[PDB]
Design a protein around this ligand. Structure first.
Ligand SMILES: [Mg+2]
Ligand SMILES: [Mg+2]
Ligand SMILES: [Mg+2]
Ligand SMILES: [Mg+2]
Ligand SMILES: [Mg+2]
Ligand SMILES: [Mg+2]
Ligand SMILES: [Mg+2]
Ligand SMILES: [Mg+2]
Ligand SMILES: [Mg+2]
Ligand SMILES: [Mg+2]
Ligand SMILES: [Mg+2]
Ligand SMILES: [Mg+2]
Ligand SMILES: [Mg+2]
Ligand SMILES: [Mg+2]
Ligand SMILES: [Zn+2]
Lengths: 64, 100, 196, 55
RNA sequence: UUAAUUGGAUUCAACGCCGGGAACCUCACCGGGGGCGACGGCAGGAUGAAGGCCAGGCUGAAGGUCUUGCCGGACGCGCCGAGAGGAGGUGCAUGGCCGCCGUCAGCUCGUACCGUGAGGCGUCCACUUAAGUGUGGUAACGAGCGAGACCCGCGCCCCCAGUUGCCAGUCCCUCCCGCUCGGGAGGGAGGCACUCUGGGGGGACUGCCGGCGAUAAGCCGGAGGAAGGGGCGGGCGACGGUAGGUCAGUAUGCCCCGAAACCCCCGGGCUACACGCGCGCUACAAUGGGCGGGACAAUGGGUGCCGACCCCGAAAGGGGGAGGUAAUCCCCUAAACCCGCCCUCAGUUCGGAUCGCGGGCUGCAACUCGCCCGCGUGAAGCUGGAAUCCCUAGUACCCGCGCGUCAUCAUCGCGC
C-alpha cells in the first residue's frame, strides 16, 4: 500500500501556502526548493515531500 | 627515513579527526605524506541463546563490535615529527608509530 | 591480536563500575570515567554526596585507591570526585532514589508522584515509572505511572531515551523499579521545521 | 595438617578449569577473544562493552 | 532394572531442549574416608593451651587415628547462644529475563454530550490499505502509545585515497617451443589504469503516459531505467493476559540442615535393556559402484596457538623447523561436475551393520567408557498401509566447507 504519511502531507501543505510562487511542475526544481527551505535530513522524506508538492501544484493549476 | 603510523578505533569520527590533524600538520610543512589508506574493518560477532531456561521456541541474539583502521606513511622530519608527537588523541583511539 | 586488547580494557571498566555501584550506593553514585596519562590513571567518580565518598577526611579514598590497584589491574591510580551534571535527567539515579524512599517506608504512590513531579519540573519531555512486587498483600502486582512524550520502539527509542533499573529490599521481599526519561533536546525523525 | 582437606586440585583442562568472572558458574562459558563470561551474564552486559544488535 | 541409574520440560508452545558432544572435574545421585562454629560467654590453660611432625600398625591410601616422643607458645565446640555455607523445599511468596496469543492492529486519554446505573460516544457507516493505513459522511471535536517513520546489509554510478591489496600498457635480464617471423613463463624496475578495500555523495518520487474509481483516497497497465510501486533480507514486539518456564545462571522473603542437607579426596553411576515414541544419518543401486586422470569458492580463525619447507614410514602417524600479535605468514590446490577403462539388473564389484587379530594419538588415568589406521568377516534392506511435514526465486532439492562446544571426541547448533 502506497499511502502517503500524515506529517508529509501536513508539511507539504504548509510549504505550499507559505510560498505559492516558488514551486513548478518539475520534480527536480521542487526537490531543490524543499532541500533549501526546510531542515529535513533524510533523502527519502525530501523526495516524498517534493512529489506531493508537485502533485498539489498540478492539481491547483488544473483548478480541481 | 620514513615513519609509519597505525590508527585503530571503534568510533569512526574520532579516527577521521586524528587523520585530518596529521594531514594538516603535514600540509603546513614541506613534506610528502602518503594518504590515509583504509584497511579492512574488524567485525566481532557473537550469537547467543536468549532464554535462561530451555523451554519455549529457540531465539537468538547477534551482537557485533566493529573496529576501524587507518594507515599513514610520512618521511621523518624533526620539524614535523615533534608536532605529531605532541597531538593528543581521544581515549578511544589507539596510535602506534614506528620508523622504517 | 588487536581485538584482544580492546576487549580486555572494556571488561575492566565494567567490573570496576559494578563494584563502585554496589559500594557507593548511599552516595548517589552516577558513573565513572577512566583516562590514561603517562604518569598513570585518572579516575573520575560522579556522585551526589562527595562527603560520603571522601569519608571524613580521607580514610576512604586511600582505601578505594588501594583496592583499585590491588584487586583490579589499574596502575598508579588517582581518584578525583566530582558532581553529577543533570541528576534529574539520569534514570539510574532516580531509580535508586525511589528504591531508597521505598525502603524508608513511604507509600509507593507518593514516591512515584513526587519523582515524576520533580523530573517534569526540571524540563523533561516525558517520563515513565514502573513498580512491581508484593505491594499491599501476598499476591504480586505491577503499577505504571506516565506523563509526557515517550518513544517505546524503534531506533530513536534505543538512542535517545535514558533507562534505569533498581531493586528495593523490604521485609517481605524485593521490589523492582524501572525508570525511563526523555531529554528535552531529543528530536524525533518526523519533526520538521520550515526555515523562514 | 588439617587445612589440606579443603583445598582443591589445580586442574588445567576440563569443565572445572573455567568459571564466570561475574557469577562463578561452571558450564556455558564464552571463550571468544579472551572473554570469560557465562551466556547468561554476557547478554546483560553486552551494551556496556560496546556491542550492538545491528541485524 | 539397579546401591544409584540426579533433576526440570508433556498438544501447537516437552522429546540434537536446559547452549546437556558428562572418562576425572562439571555433579546435584550411590559406597566409603576426612575437615569446618566470626563474636559473646562456661570447664580449662606457661607447672603450658589451641596446633605440627621422623619411623611403624589400622587403611584403597593417609600424623586421619594409634604406637613410639619430639615439637611451639595464648587461647580455648568438652558446654550453651550465635554465625559461615547450602545445585535443600516453595516459579502458587518475589525481582529480572524468556516463550505464546502476535509484528496481530490493537489499548487509551482531555472536554463535551447520552443513560437512574453498570456503561456508551469518539473507536460507527461507504470505499481503500499489509496496518485504528487513508479519503468523504456523522454528538462529537481534538490528543497519546503501537503501525509507519527509524537503524544495519545487498544491487548501479561519481569524488578522495594506493599499503601489507591490484599488474593492463612501457623498459631491462634469464629460460622454453614449430628455431623464431611469431608465441609463452618467471624476476627487477616502474605505475594506481582495472579488481579490491572504506570515507563522502548521487540515484526512485506513483515523478511521466493511458484507463477504473468520485473529480478524493487509491487501484490496474505501459515507457525509460542497475533498480518500480514497504526495491530485496534483517533489528526493534504497544496496554495486558497466560498463577505458561526459570529460585539448578546471578539477586531475593519464609521454612528447613547447621557437626550435617556445609567443604574436600578415592572408586562407581548419569552410557543398564523383553519393549512404545520424536528428530535425523546410511541405503535398498545404472538418474549407478570401482580405478586412473582434469576443473572452479566463500564465510571465519590463529601466541596455552596456526604452522609452510625438508627427512623417516604402507597408513594412521613420527623427528627438525622459516614466517606470523596478521589485507604481509598459516589453516587452504573443496565436493557435487567432466574424460577414459572394468562391472550389465544380480542380495551382485549394491549395502556396510556386527565381530577377530594387529598398529597409533590426547590425557595424571582409555576395563566399565574415547577417537584414528591395515587385513579379514559380511546382518536387515529389492521403493515403504492408515496417516502426515517443509517450501513462491538465487527460493526448494542436491553438494561440500567455516566457527561454537574442545587436552582428545560432531550424524548437533549458528553461518558460508
Ligand atoms: Mg530423566
Ligand atoms: Mg549439544
Ligand atoms: Mg562424552
Ligand atoms: Mg563424573
Ligand atoms: Mg508462574
Ligand atoms: Mg447523567
Ligand atoms: Mg458502539
Ligand atoms: Mg494509528
Ligand atoms: Mg516499524
Ligand atoms: Mg506455574
Ligand atoms: Mg544422558
Ligand atoms: Mg560396495
Ligand atoms: Mg573401551
Ligand atoms: Mg534390486
Ligand atoms: Zn555468568
Amino acid at each position: 500500500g502506497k499511502i502517503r504519511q500524515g506529517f508529509i502531507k501536513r508539511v507539504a501543505r504548509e510549504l505550499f501556502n507559505k510560498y505559492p510562487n516558488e514551486f513548478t511542475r518539475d520534480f527536480e526544481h521542487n526537490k531543490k526548493k524543499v532541500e533549501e527551505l526546510t531542515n529535513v535530513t533524510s533523502k527519502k522524506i525530501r523526495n516524498r515531500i517534493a512529489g506531493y508538492i508537485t502533485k498539489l501544484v498540478r492539481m491547483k493549476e488544473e483548478g480541481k | 627515513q620514513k615513519a609509519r603510523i597505525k590508527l585503530a578505533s571503534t568510533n569512526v569520527r574520532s579516527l577521521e579527526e586524528v587523520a585530518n590533524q596529521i594531514k594538516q600538520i603535514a600540509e603546513r610543512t614541506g613534506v610528502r605524506m602518503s594518504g590515509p589508506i583504509p584497511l579492512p574493518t574488524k567485525r566481532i560477532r557473537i550469537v547467543t541463546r536468549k532464554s535462561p531456561d530451555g523451554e519455549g521456541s529457540a531465539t537468538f541474539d547477534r551482537w557485533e563490535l566493529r573496529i576501524h583502521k587507518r594507515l599513514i606513511d610520512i618521511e621523518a622530519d624533526e620539524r614535523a615529527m615533534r608536532q605529531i608527537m605532541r597531538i593528543r588523541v581521544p581515549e578511544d583511539v589507539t596510535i602506534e608509530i614506528e620508523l622504517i | 591480536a588487536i581485538e584482544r586488547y580492546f576487549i580486555r580494557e572494556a571488561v575492566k571498566e565494567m567490573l570496576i563500575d559494578e563494584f563502585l555501584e554496589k559500594e557507593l550506593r548511599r552516595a548517589g553514585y552516577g558513573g565513572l570515567d577512566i583516562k590514561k596519562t603517562p604518569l598513570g590513571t585518572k579516575v573520575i567518580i560522579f556522585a551526589a554526596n562527595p562527603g560520603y565518598v571522601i569519608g571524613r577526611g580521607g580514610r576512604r579514598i586511600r582505601e578505594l585507591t588501594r583496592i583499585l590497584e590491588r584487586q583490579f589491574g589499574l596502575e598508579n591510580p588517582q581518584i578525583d570526585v566530582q558532581e553529577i551534571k543533570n541528576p534529574y535527567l539520569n534514570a539510574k539515579v532516580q531509580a535508586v532514589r525511589i528504591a531508597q524512599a521505598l525502603e524508608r517506608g513511604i507509600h509507593f504512590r507518593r514516591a512515584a508522584y513526587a519523582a515524576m513531579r520533580a523530573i517534569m519540573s526540571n524540563g523533561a519531555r516525558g517520563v515513565e515509572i514502573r513498580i512491581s512486587g508484593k505491594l499491599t498483600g501476598e499476591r504480586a502486582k505491577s503499577v505504571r505511572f506516565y506523563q509526557g512524550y515517550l518513544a517505546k520502539v524503534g531506533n530513536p527509542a534505543e538512542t535517545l531515551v535514558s533507562k534505569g533499573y533498581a531493586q528495593a529490599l523490604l521485609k517481605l521481599g524485593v521490589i523492582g523499579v524501572k525508570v525511563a526519561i526523555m531529554p528535552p533536546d531529543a528530536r524525533l525523525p518526523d519533526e520538521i521545521e520550515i526555515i523562514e | 595438617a588439617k587445612a589440606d582437606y579443603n583445598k582443591r586440585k589445580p586442574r588445567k583442562f576440563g569443565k572445572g578449569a573455567r568459571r564466570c568472572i561475574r557469577c562463578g558458574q561452571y558450564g556455558p562459558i564464552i571463550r571468544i577473544h579472551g572473554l570469560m563470561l557465562c551466556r547468561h551474564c554476557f547478554r546483560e552486559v553486552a551494551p556496556k562493552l560496546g556491542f550492538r544488535k545491528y541485524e
